[PDB]
Amino acid sequence: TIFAETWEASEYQYRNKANLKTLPVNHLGKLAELKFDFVEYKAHQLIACHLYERMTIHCMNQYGLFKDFYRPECLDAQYYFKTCVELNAAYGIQKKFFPEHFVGSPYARPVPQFQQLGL
């Protein structure tokens, strides 16, 4: 689990595998595409995947779930939120049981003890 608002991108990139995905920060630009009026505090937009969650709520309050929620600004928020928590759940597990896969980990390329050098 991430216990902060900011994380180093390199810490979630692989060292011995091709990097085909990143763990990007929240897309604050999607928040300006909501046409209706809403109240959002800047203190909640950086934490991972929560912005897309609040946006989905704002859109599900203004509109419902039938024939009015089906607009591009609201479906992309629901899709982002659902996708953000799935990717973060997998990255979090991979960080817990496979920390050696990521850059910055001292086990990705272990540095040997001085007793192994024969000096």
Structure tokens at 77: 């928020």
Q: Breaks in the chain at C–N > 2.5 Å: after which residues?
A: none
* Residue 18 φ then ψ, to 5°: -65, 140
Please report how close the Cβ of residue 94 comes to other proteins at its closest, in angstroms.
Answer: 8
Please report how close the Cβ of residue 117 comes to other proteins at its closest, in angstroms.
Answer: 19
Sites of contact with other proteins (CB under 8 A): 1-9, 19-22, 24-25, 27-30, 33, 39, 41-44, 47-50, 53-54, 57-58, 60-61, 64, 67, 70-72, 75-76, 79-80, 83-97, 104
DSSP helix/strand/coil, 102: strand
Please report how close the Cβ of residue 108 comes to other proteins at its closest, in angstroms.
Answer: 14
Nearer of residues 4 and 117 to other proteins, judged by Cβ: 4
HSE at residue 18, side-chain half, CA atoms within 13 A, is: 1
